[PDB]
Amino acid sequence: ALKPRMRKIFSRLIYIAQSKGAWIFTGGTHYGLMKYIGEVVRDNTISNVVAIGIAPLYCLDNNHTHLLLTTEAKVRTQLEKYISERVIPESNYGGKIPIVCFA
Amino acid sequence: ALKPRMRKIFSRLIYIAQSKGAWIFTGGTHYGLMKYIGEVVRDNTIS
Amino acid sequence: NAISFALYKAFSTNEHDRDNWNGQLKLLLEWNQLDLASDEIFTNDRNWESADLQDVMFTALVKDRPKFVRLFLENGLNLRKFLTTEVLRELYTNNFSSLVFKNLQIAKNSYNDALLTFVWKMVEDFRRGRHPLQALFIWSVLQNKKELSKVIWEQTRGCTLAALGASKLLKSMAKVKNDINAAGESEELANEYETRAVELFTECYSNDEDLAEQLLTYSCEAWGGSNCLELAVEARDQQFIAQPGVQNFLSKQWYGEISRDTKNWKIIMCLFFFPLIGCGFISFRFLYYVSFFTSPFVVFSWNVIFYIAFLLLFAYVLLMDFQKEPTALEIILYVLVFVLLCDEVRQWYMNGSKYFSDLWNVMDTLAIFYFIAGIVFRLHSDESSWYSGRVIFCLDYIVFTLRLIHIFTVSRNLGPKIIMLQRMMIDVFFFLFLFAVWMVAFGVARQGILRKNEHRWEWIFRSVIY
Amino acid sequence: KIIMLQRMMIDVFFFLFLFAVWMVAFGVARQGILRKNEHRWEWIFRSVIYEPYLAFPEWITIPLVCIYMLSTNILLVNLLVAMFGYTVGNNDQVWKFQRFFLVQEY
Amino acid sequence: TIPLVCIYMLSTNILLVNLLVAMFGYTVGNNDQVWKFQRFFLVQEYCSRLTIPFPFVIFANEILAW
Amino acid sequence: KNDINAAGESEELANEYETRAVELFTECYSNDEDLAEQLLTYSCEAWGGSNCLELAVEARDQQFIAQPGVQNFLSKQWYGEISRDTKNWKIIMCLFFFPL
Ligand SMILES: CC(C)CCC[C@@H](C)[C@H]1CC[C@H]2[C@@H]3CC=C4C[C@@H](OC(=O)CCC(=O)O)CC[C@]4(C)[C@H]3CC[C@]12C
Ligand code: NA
Ligand code: NA
């Protein structure tokens, strides 16, 4: 249920991620919020978010620019810990690349 | 932190002390509220 | 408010940023967390020195944080010692947006003013190479930093001035139609600097009124080079000048050193009879006559009764006198026109070729230029030009009455009817122009019908009109 | 209508005064042109007023009509300013007091 | 002669309309503030004159703590 | 005027589609103004066959056309490719003298 409040959260978030140049890891399928997310990243690459998707058979979301198709929600954890350890000498968050997990 | 409320207290106080002719004992140093206090006593010895 | 509140918690609980509190400030400055930074960083149980706050303030300006520039100032920051000249040129050369800077060049050219020539010089020599706090306020009011320029305004030394001068810098850039949104936001920002300077003056006027009016004519040490009152009339700040503080100051100025509580006629009964000033019949405030004849009420009252008595000896020289010799009654009528001309060469000063754009100062100037032709037609001794010199004196008697009528037309209806008049006066100027266009049409349709059909000269270029 | 009237009545009192000032001007520019040029007495102090009430072009006829455009402006403007002098200037209370002050005078 | 009076109806229209548009050009267009500034601008133009009579024209930082 | 109530409810519903299209355009005009004016003259693939601006003038939507977005677009159209910041007389002094 993408409520008019629930679409206020996940569209202000895309503009915030545009002002910072973030990545968005999500379930790369053509349903739910994940379909609504991909429509906003498609519409906001004209104004620098990169939406990486990680996944009967579910239809694939045709709005994630890089797709990463149980046995797959373990490289998602392996990915973020390599990112969260990764020190960068720009060093505004003490380096270490700030991670948020929206649930 | 001389807040806009914290400067409301210590500037109404100077005018109250002006209407009564008081003394103000404070830490005589060029910092903090004590610097902000001394600016109001400088500006209120003209009235 | 949820991401930065979550990201701050994972940063703060690393147990190594107690010394590195400066990391938590730039984190909370990259986002907009005023209430979190004021409670958990600037709360005085931690040891900071407020001298390494200067590289954080420079990012708090150029990243458009109008709430943190107020926070660093209320936590102690000497802004008149922070604003060094290399800091100010990092703003105008790097962090001044090129769209507003290209908007400034078009603002400087098509609407040229003494204020804008000061600002266009200021952006230029800051992009080339003291009162510095009055330069940061210019930096934030050009680019319409609407919440940030309210903070820098609160630090300025004289703020009855700088709220009005920024109200001019906006309104002179709110007419550039390259971006009507940026010209629209500059218009609504200047209205709340008018309003910011109205109540700052009425509070200055609810106290001692003589203390307030000294601030209206302050020299300002050449901020814009103008005073607070002259900065308002050139910017057409109608809300500032229509307040009862300033309109009282003009009425105290126009009556001058005479008090306004004598009567109206009580001054006029002293213009005729000079011994009545020396009594207590006037209540002005040793040689009160210099205070009397220098107040602009009696100056304007002299130049009407002298101008009325100018015409009654202009009529007397035109009926009894004016036989063949320019007699003694005409030589004073010669020099009084020259006296009425020798101020117009000073009205030829401070005009800028636009004080002749009221269509009534020119009718006063074409009056005197029609009078010198009557002098040229006078001393020629032939009866064909003597009578032709009498006729362009008599037509000039109307114009020297139409100046006097235009004096009475304005000076009675000077009030709420001064916008009804002089907007209507151009509207009848337009109507009689459309009448005279129609009379040329009706002349041709009368000349093209009646006789002398083909009997043509340069007669026809002048007969069809009259 | 007692505030519309008697504010307008002074406004036409002012306009006809500016008309009579102009008629003295147009009288002099009529007496100073026609004959009895130098035939003068205290005749002239009283003839110049009533004479417009009962009523060579080398380049001078074109400013004369420009005078007849400037003169008819500044009198017509004062006519219409007299037409709307009541308009400028709680309008309910101000006429009931002026209605009260006239009847209490009577 | 019948369009000539139609001209004498069309000509007297477009001049009479411009007469009455001139009669109410002041009406269109905060009305209190706009006349006090125009009252201010005229007197300050006359206060910008020399404050001497007509025949004589040929003759011619601690307050901020408050 | 067969049913003035249904003709009255259609009148007050159209006023909150005017108002629904005023603020949807001023938000489109508070952003890039050249991007907004391309939407005013869109071909629409024959929805009614008209553009958004021509649909407003035939419906006499006075609230939509009197907004400062569209009235700026006309003044930028009537001055044309000349900028509006030259002067008024500056164009007129170029009509007489072609080298200027
Ligand atoms: C006897 C005859 C030959 C002489 C008549 C004298 C008048 C021509 C003079 C003397 C009194 C004068 C007036 C005295 C008071 C003023 C008020 C003044 O109104 C204002 O308040 C100005 C606006 C302002 O600054 O407040 C305008 C001029 C006026 C009418 C003066 C205009 C000319 C007057 C009528
Ligand atoms: Na006339
Ligand atoms: Na006619």
Short mmCIF file of all heavy atoms in Angstrom, two decimals, chain C residues 247 250-251 254-255 264-265 268 271-272 297 300-301 304-305 308-309 312 404 407-408 410-412 414-415, chain D residues 17, chain E residues 39 43 47, ligand 1:
data_model
loop_
_atom_site.label_atom_id
_atom_site.label_comp_id
_atom_site.label_asym_id
_atom_site.label_seq_id
_atom_site.Cartn_x
_atom_site.Cartn_y
_atom_site.Cartn_z
N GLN C 247 6.44 61.63 7.72
CA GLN C 247 5.53 62.67 7.27
C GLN C 247 5.39 63.78 8.31
O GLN C 247 5.07 64.92 7.95
CB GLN C 247 4.17 62.08 6.95
CG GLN C 247 4.19 61.10 5.81
CD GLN C 247 3.92 61.74 4.48
OE1 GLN C 247 3.21 62.75 4.40
NE2 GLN C 247 4.47 61.18 3.42
N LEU C 250 8.67 65.93 7.58
CA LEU C 250 8.56 66.86 6.46
C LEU C 250 7.74 68.09 6.83
O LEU C 250 8.10 69.21 6.47
CB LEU C 250 7.94 66.18 5.25
CG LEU C 250 8.39 66.86 3.96
CD1 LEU C 250 9.89 66.69 3.75
CD2 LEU C 250 7.60 66.39 2.76
N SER C 251 6.63 67.89 7.54
CA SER C 251 5.80 69.02 7.93
C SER C 251 6.49 69.89 8.97
O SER C 251 6.23 71.09 9.04
CB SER C 251 4.46 68.52 8.47
OG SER C 251 3.76 69.57 9.12
N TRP C 254 8.93 71.68 6.44
CA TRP C 254 8.36 72.65 5.51
C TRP C 254 7.91 73.91 6.24
O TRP C 254 8.03 75.02 5.70
CB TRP C 254 7.19 72.04 4.74
CG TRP C 254 6.88 72.83 3.53
CD1 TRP C 254 7.68 73.00 2.44
CD2 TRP C 254 5.70 73.57 3.28
NE1 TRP C 254 7.06 73.80 1.52
CE2 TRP C 254 5.84 74.16 2.01
CE3 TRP C 254 4.52 73.79 4.00
CZ2 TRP C 254 4.85 74.96 1.45
CZ3 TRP C 254 3.54 74.58 3.43
CH2 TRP C 254 3.72 75.15 2.17
N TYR C 255 7.38 73.77 7.45
CA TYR C 255 7.16 74.94 8.29
C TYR C 255 8.47 75.50 8.81
O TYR C 255 8.52 76.68 9.19
CB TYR C 255 6.24 74.59 9.46
CG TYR C 255 4.78 74.67 9.12
CD1 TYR C 255 4.19 73.75 8.27
CD2 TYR C 255 3.97 75.66 9.67
CE1 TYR C 255 2.85 73.81 7.96
CE2 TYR C 255 2.63 75.74 9.37
CZ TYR C 255 2.07 74.81 8.51
OH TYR C 255 0.73 74.88 8.21
N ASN C 264 -2.51 78.95 10.60
CA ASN C 264 -2.07 79.03 9.21
C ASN C 264 -1.95 80.48 8.76
O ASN C 264 -0.94 80.85 8.15
CB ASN C 264 -3.03 78.27 8.31
CG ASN C 264 -2.33 77.65 7.11
OD1 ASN C 264 -1.11 77.61 7.05
ND2 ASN C 264 -3.12 77.16 6.15
N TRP C 265 -2.95 81.30 9.05
CA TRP C 265 -2.95 82.69 8.61
C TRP C 265 -2.02 83.57 9.42
O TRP C 265 -1.72 84.69 8.99
CB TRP C 265 -4.36 83.26 8.68
CG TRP C 265 -4.95 83.20 10.04
CD1 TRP C 265 -5.66 82.16 10.58
CD2 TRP C 265 -4.90 84.21 11.06
NE1 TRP C 265 -6.05 82.47 11.86
CE2 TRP C 265 -5.60 83.72 12.17
CE3 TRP C 265 -4.33 85.48 11.12
CZ2 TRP C 265 -5.74 84.45 13.35
CZ3 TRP C 265 -4.47 86.21 12.29
CH2 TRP C 265 -5.17 85.70 13.38
N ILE C 268 0.96 84.47 7.52
CA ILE C 268 0.63 85.29 6.36
C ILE C 268 0.36 86.73 6.77
O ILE C 268 0.73 87.67 6.06
CB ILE C 268 -0.56 84.67 5.62
CG1 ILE C 268 -0.25 83.21 5.30
CG2 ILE C 268 -0.85 85.41 4.34
CD1 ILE C 268 0.98 83.03 4.44
N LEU C 271 3.88 88.35 6.89
CA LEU C 271 4.60 88.65 5.66
C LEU C 271 4.35 90.08 5.21
O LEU C 271 5.28 90.75 4.73
CB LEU C 271 4.18 87.68 4.56
CG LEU C 271 4.99 87.75 3.27
CD1 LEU C 271 5.48 86.38 2.89
CD2 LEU C 271 4.15 88.33 2.16
N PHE C 272 3.11 90.56 5.35
CA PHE C 272 2.78 91.92 4.93
C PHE C 272 3.37 92.96 5.87
O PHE C 272 3.85 94.01 5.41
CB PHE C 272 1.26 92.08 4.85
CG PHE C 272 0.61 91.26 3.77
CD1 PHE C 272 -0.72 90.89 3.89
CD2 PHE C 272 1.31 90.87 2.65
CE1 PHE C 272 -1.34 90.15 2.90
CE2 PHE C 272 0.71 90.12 1.66
CZ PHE C 272 -0.62 89.76 1.78
N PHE C 297 8.11 77.51 4.08
CA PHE C 297 6.73 77.95 3.98
C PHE C 297 6.68 79.40 3.52
O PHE C 297 5.95 79.74 2.59
CB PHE C 297 6.02 77.79 5.32
CG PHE C 297 4.60 78.27 5.32
CD1 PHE C 297 3.74 77.94 4.29
CD2 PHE C 297 4.12 79.05 6.35
CE1 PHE C 297 2.44 78.38 4.29
CE2 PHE C 297 2.82 79.50 6.36
CZ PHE C 297 1.97 79.16 5.33
N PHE C 300 8.00 79.81 -0.13
CA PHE C 300 6.96 79.53 -1.11
C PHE C 300 5.85 80.57 -1.04
O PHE C 300 5.23 80.89 -2.05
CB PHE C 300 6.38 78.13 -0.90
CG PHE C 300 5.31 77.77 -1.89
CD1 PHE C 300 5.64 77.35 -3.17
CD2 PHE C 300 3.97 77.83 -1.53
CE1 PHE C 300 4.65 77.01 -4.07
CE2 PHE C 300 2.98 77.49 -2.44
CZ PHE C 300 3.33 77.08 -3.71
N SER C 301 5.58 81.09 0.16
CA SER C 301 4.56 82.13 0.26
C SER C 301 5.06 83.46 -0.29
O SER C 301 4.24 84.30 -0.67
CB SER C 301 4.10 82.30 1.70
OG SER C 301 3.35 83.48 1.85
N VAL C 304 4.76 83.41 -4.39
CA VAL C 304 3.43 83.49 -4.98
C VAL C 304 2.93 84.92 -5.01
O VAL C 304 2.51 85.42 -6.05
CB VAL C 304 2.45 82.56 -4.24
CG1 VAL C 304 1.06 82.72 -4.78
CG2 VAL C 304 2.89 81.13 -4.37
N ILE C 305 3.02 85.62 -3.87
CA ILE C 305 2.62 87.02 -3.84
C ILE C 305 3.61 87.91 -4.59
O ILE C 305 3.23 88.99 -5.05
CB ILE C 305 2.43 87.50 -2.39
CG1 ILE C 305 1.89 86.36 -1.53
CG2 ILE C 305 1.46 88.67 -2.34
CD1 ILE C 305 1.58 86.75 -0.10
N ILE C 308 2.38 87.02 -8.17
CA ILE C 308 1.14 87.72 -8.46
C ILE C 308 1.43 89.19 -8.73
O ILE C 308 0.95 89.76 -9.72
CB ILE C 308 0.13 87.54 -7.31
CG1 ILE C 308 -0.43 86.12 -7.33
CG2 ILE C 308 -0.98 88.57 -7.38
CD1 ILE C 308 -1.54 85.88 -6.33
N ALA C 309 2.25 89.82 -7.89
CA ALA C 309 2.67 91.19 -8.14
C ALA C 309 3.63 91.32 -9.30
O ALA C 309 3.91 92.44 -9.73
CB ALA C 309 3.30 91.79 -6.88
N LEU C 312 0.81 91.83 -12.14
CA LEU C 312 0.08 93.10 -12.10
C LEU C 312 0.93 94.27 -12.56
O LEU C 312 0.38 95.31 -12.93
CB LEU C 312 -0.46 93.35 -10.69
CG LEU C 312 -1.39 92.28 -10.13
CD1 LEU C 312 -2.02 92.75 -8.83
CD2 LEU C 312 -2.46 91.90 -11.13
N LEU C 404 0.96 80.38 -12.89
CA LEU C 404 0.32 80.74 -11.63
C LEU C 404 -0.91 79.89 -11.37
O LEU C 404 -1.19 79.55 -10.21
CB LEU C 404 -0.05 82.22 -11.64
CG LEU C 404 -0.74 82.78 -10.39
CD1 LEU C 404 0.17 82.65 -9.19
CD2 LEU C 404 -1.14 84.22 -10.60
N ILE C 407 0.30 76.63 -10.23
CA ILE C 407 0.71 76.70 -8.83
C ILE C 407 -0.50 76.48 -7.93
O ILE C 407 -0.45 75.67 -7.00
CB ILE C 407 1.41 78.03 -8.55
CG1 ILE C 407 2.85 77.98 -9.07
CG2 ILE C 407 1.42 78.34 -7.06
CD1 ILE C 407 3.66 79.22 -8.77
N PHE C 408 -1.61 77.17 -8.21
CA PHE C 408 -2.80 77.02 -7.39
C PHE C 408 -3.47 75.67 -7.59
O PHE C 408 -4.12 75.16 -6.67
CB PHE C 408 -3.81 78.13 -7.70
CG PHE C 408 -3.34 79.50 -7.33
CD1 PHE C 408 -3.80 80.60 -8.01
CD2 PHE C 408 -2.43 79.68 -6.29
CE1 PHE C 408 -3.38 81.86 -7.68
CE2 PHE C 408 -2.01 80.95 -5.96
CZ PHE C 408 -2.48 82.04 -6.65
N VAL C 410 -1.89 72.78 -8.10
CA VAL C 410 -1.14 71.81 -7.32
C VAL C 410 -1.27 72.08 -5.83
O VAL C 410 -1.59 71.18 -5.05
CB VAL C 410 0.33 71.81 -7.78
CG1 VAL C 410 1.21 71.07 -6.79
CG2 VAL C 410 0.45 71.19 -9.15
N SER C 411 -1.07 73.33 -5.42
CA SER C 411 -0.91 73.64 -4.00
C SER C 411 -2.21 73.53 -3.21
O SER C 411 -2.16 73.47 -1.98
CB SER C 411 -0.34 75.04 -3.82
OG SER C 411 -1.37 76.00 -3.75
N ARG C 412 -3.37 73.52 -3.86
CA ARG C 412 -4.58 73.23 -3.11
C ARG C 412 -4.85 71.73 -3.05
O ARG C 412 -5.18 71.20 -1.99
CB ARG C 412 -5.79 73.94 -3.71
CG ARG C 412 -7.04 73.68 -2.90
CD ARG C 412 -8.26 74.32 -3.48
NE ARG C 412 -9.44 73.99 -2.69
CZ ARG C 412 -10.20 72.93 -2.90
NH1 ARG C 412 -9.90 72.08 -3.87
NH2 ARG C 412 -11.25 72.70 -2.13
N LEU C 414 -2.76 69.31 -3.17
CA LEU C 414 -1.59 68.56 -2.74
C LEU C 414 -1.98 67.78 -1.49
O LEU C 414 -2.09 68.34 -0.40
CB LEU C 414 -0.41 69.48 -2.49
CG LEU C 414 0.89 68.78 -2.10
CD1 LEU C 414 1.26 67.77 -3.16
CD2 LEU C 414 1.99 69.81 -1.98
N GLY C 415 -2.20 66.48 -1.66
CA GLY C 415 -2.69 65.64 -0.61
C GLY C 415 -3.08 64.29 -1.18
O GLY C 415 -2.32 63.67 -1.92
N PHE D 17 -12.75 80.34 -9.47
CA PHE D 17 -11.70 81.30 -9.16
C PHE D 17 -10.54 81.16 -10.13
O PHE D 17 -9.99 82.17 -10.59
CB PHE D 17 -11.23 81.12 -7.72
CG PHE D 17 -9.90 81.75 -7.44
CD1 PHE D 17 -9.77 83.13 -7.43
CD2 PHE D 17 -8.79 80.97 -7.18
CE1 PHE D 17 -8.55 83.71 -7.17
CE2 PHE D 17 -7.57 81.55 -6.92
CZ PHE D 17 -7.45 82.93 -6.92
N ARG E 39 2.81 62.94 -2.18
CA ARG E 39 2.87 64.19 -1.44
C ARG E 39 4.28 64.47 -0.95
O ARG E 39 4.71 65.63 -0.93
CB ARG E 39 1.88 64.16 -0.27
CG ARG E 39 1.86 65.39 0.63
CD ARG E 39 2.46 65.08 1.99
NE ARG E 39 2.48 66.25 2.86
CZ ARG E 39 3.39 66.45 3.81
NH1 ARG E 39 4.36 65.57 4.00
NH2 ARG E 39 3.33 67.54 4.56
N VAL E 43 6.93 67.93 -2.39
CA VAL E 43 7.46 68.89 -1.43
C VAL E 43 8.98 68.76 -1.31
O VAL E 43 9.69 69.76 -1.18
CB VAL E 43 6.77 68.73 -0.07
CG1 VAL E 43 7.12 69.87 0.85
CG2 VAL E 43 5.28 68.74 -0.26
N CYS E 47 11.54 71.39 -1.60
CA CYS E 47 12.56 71.56 -0.57
C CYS E 47 13.97 71.43 -1.15
O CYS E 47 14.93 71.88 -0.51
CB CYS E 47 12.37 70.55 0.56
SG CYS E 47 11.06 70.98 1.73
C1 LIG G 1 -4.27 89.58 -1.37
C2 LIG G 1 -3.74 88.81 -2.58
C3 LIG G 1 -3.21 89.80 -3.62
C4 LIG G 1 -2.62 87.88 -2.14
C5 LIG G 1 -3.20 86.51 -1.78
C6 LIG G 1 -2.17 85.74 -0.95
C7 LIG G 1 -2.12 84.20 -1.39
C8 LIG G 1 -1.85 84.20 -2.97
C9 LIG G 1 -1.14 83.50 -0.72
C10 LIG G 1 -1.03 83.95 0.88
C11 LIG G 1 -1.50 82.67 1.70
C12 LIG G 1 -0.91 81.47 0.81
C13 LIG G 1 -1.12 79.98 1.17
C14 LIG G 1 -0.81 79.79 2.78
C15 LIG G 1 -0.88 78.37 3.21
C16 LIG G 1 -0.51 77.16 2.09
C17 LIG G 1 -0.69 75.68 2.45
C18 LIG G 1 0.17 74.72 1.59
O1 LIG G 1 -0.35 73.40 1.75
C19 LIG G 1 0.55 72.46 2.27
O2 LIG G 1 0.34 71.97 3.32
C20 LIG G 1 1.79 72.05 1.48
C21 LIG G 1 2.03 70.55 1.65
C22 LIG G 1 2.97 70.30 2.82
O3 LIG G 1 4.21 70.43 2.67
O4 LIG G 1 2.50 69.94 3.94
C23 LIG G 1 0.10 75.06 0.15
C24 LIG G 1 0.26 76.55 -0.19
C25 LIG G 1 -0.64 77.47 0.66
C26 LIG G 1 -2.11 77.26 0.25
C27 LIG G 1 -0.30 79.10 0.31
C28 LIG G 1 -0.59 79.38 -1.17
C29 LIG G 1 -0.72 80.96 -1.57
C30 LIG G 1 -1.33 81.81 -0.64
C31 LIG G 1 -2.84 81.50 -0.70
#
